[PDB]
């Protein structure tokens, strides 16, 4: 054939990949502490002899969007929201250290703090709270525990949440949705990120997802139009080859 | 066997028919959840390579093998499915629909081109027999 | 299941579940000692197609 069909076909398939990314972002429009994935087409030119006429296209996800989302006021002392450019630290699935923005902190029957089922990492390893005690979280992450039955004079600090500062260019979303330091950024900032004393959290507010609707809509419209365009070419090439095959006759 | 160009073009026709069959099978089973063994349907692909064993560089086309794609299978969340794993995820085929449609059309076009080649070669061989009346 | 009709179906189902939770909260306003429900969502495993 004329491999021009293999260019428009790639452009049509990567458009479906982009649509699958955008639809995934739209599905998580209500996920607490969600970071939308950025999608971008990139052109790769095929190198070789003769007129460099073929340039294929391949989707690309250049990190995520770090713009803070909405702050819903839920009058719950455990739901916290982070200052912009801030991250909470939890223990990842494989016993590693991961970063998140979901402040929906839950207390188990044994007293351990968890986020989405992952243990919360305190100044010194996971945080264990006295069993069945009221928890208040300060602006700088200090945790006060009140034991029921005892007077409010008993309120004393227990542990401090680890709050780190990381930009978009330094973190990469792992396969389980937890952000981790990129290789270059890890090599310069060390393996574990030191807690920043300047980070401020807000107790009683939960951060929503930063999925922008207007950009999503525009992206879907553009993707549909591009797919239809590539499909026109895929039809042009087909007919042209169908007719060109006649020269092989007589 | 098939003389020369006859063998070459017949090999090409058979290989392109196999490729189109693979593409049609992939298109049909793009939404299959399971197979007889309980494993997800993995997209199949043919392997084209030349067959010029008796000291030649060009000899036509033959399909060495049919191979299943290694592109990550699509995970869908479904905890009630008997085939779901520990996390509740079910594996679904990695078929590229647009890719298989383009494969169907391209296979048809090159199959037709080889048909035109074989027909022309027959014509020429038919005229040859009338060399000098 | 073209990987874009499944992803959006999942979002539609999630929004329907959230609406069911909201309707349950609103219907049980007059009950005694009722604690309101809140729906929490999490994204599933992201698939990596090609490494950076």
């Amino acid at each position: 054939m004329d491999h021009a069909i293999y260019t428009a076909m790639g452009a049509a398939s990567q458009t479906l990949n982009q649509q699958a990314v955008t639809a995934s972002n739209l599905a998580n429009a209500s996920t607490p502490g969600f970071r939308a994935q950025l999608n971008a087409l990139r052109a790769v030119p095929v190198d070789g002899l003769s007129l460099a006429t073929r340039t294929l296209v391949t989707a690309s996800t250049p990190g995520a969007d770090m713009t803070p989302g909405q702050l819903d006021y839920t009058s719950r002392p455990l739901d916290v929201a982070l200052q912009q450019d801030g991250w909470l630290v939890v223990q990842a699935a494989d016993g590693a250290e991961g970063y998140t923005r979901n402040g929906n902190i839950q207390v188990g029957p044994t007293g351990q703090l968890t986020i989405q089922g992952h243990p919360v990492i305190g100044e010194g390893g996971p945080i264990t709270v006295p069993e069945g005690s009221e928890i208040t979280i300060a602006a700088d992450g200090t945790i006060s525990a009140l034991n029921p039955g005892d007077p409010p004079n008993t309120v004393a600090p227990v542990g401090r949440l680890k709050l780190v500062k990381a930009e978009g260019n330094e973190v990469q979303r792992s396969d389980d949705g937890l952000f981790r330091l990129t290789a270059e950024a890890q090599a310069e900032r060390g393996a574990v990120l030191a807690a920043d004393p300047s980070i401020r959290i807000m107790s009683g507010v939960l951060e929503g997802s930063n999925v922008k609707p207007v950009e999503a809509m525009t992206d879907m419209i553009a993707n549909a139009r591009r797919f239809e365009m590539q499909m026109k070419v895929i039809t042009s090439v087909d007919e042209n080859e169908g007719r060109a095959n006649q020269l092989l006759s007589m | 066997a098939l003389l020369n160009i006859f063998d070459i073009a017949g090999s090409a026709l058979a290989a392109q028919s196999k490729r189109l069959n693979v593409a049609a099978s992939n298109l049909a089973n793009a939404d299959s959840v399971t197979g007889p063994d309980g494993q997800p349907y993995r997209a199949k692909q043919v392997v084209f390579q030349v067959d010029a064993a008796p000291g030649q560089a060009t000899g036509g086309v033959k399909v060495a093998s049919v191979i299943e794609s290694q592109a990550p299978e699509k995970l869908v969340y479904e905890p009630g499915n008997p085939l779901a794993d520990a996390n509740g995820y079910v594996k679904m085929p990695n078929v590229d629909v647009v890719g298989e449609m383009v494969n169907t059309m391209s296979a048809s076009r090159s199959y037709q081109a080889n048909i035109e080649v074989l027909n022309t070669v027959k014509s020429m061989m038919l005229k040859t027999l009338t060399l000098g009346q | 299941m073209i990987s874009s009709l499944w992803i959006a179906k999942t979002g539609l189902d999630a929004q329907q579940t959230n609406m069911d939770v909201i309707a349950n909260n609103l219907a049980n306003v007059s009950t005694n000692g009722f604690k309101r429900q809140r729906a929490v969502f999490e994204d599933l495993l992201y698939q990596t197609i090609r490494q950076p």
Binding site: H3, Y6, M9, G10, S13, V44, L56, T58 | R19, A23, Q45, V46, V47, F48, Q49, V50, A64, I67, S69, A71, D96, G99, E100, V102, N103, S106 | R50, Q51
Partner: peptide, 16 residues
């Protein structure tokens, strides 16, 4: 000498 003739060889891939 050859490979998959179609979609799986005409798409960009990371190197090995």
């Amino acid at each position: 000498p050859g490979g998959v003739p179609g979609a799986l060889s005409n798409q960009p891939a990371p190197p090995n």
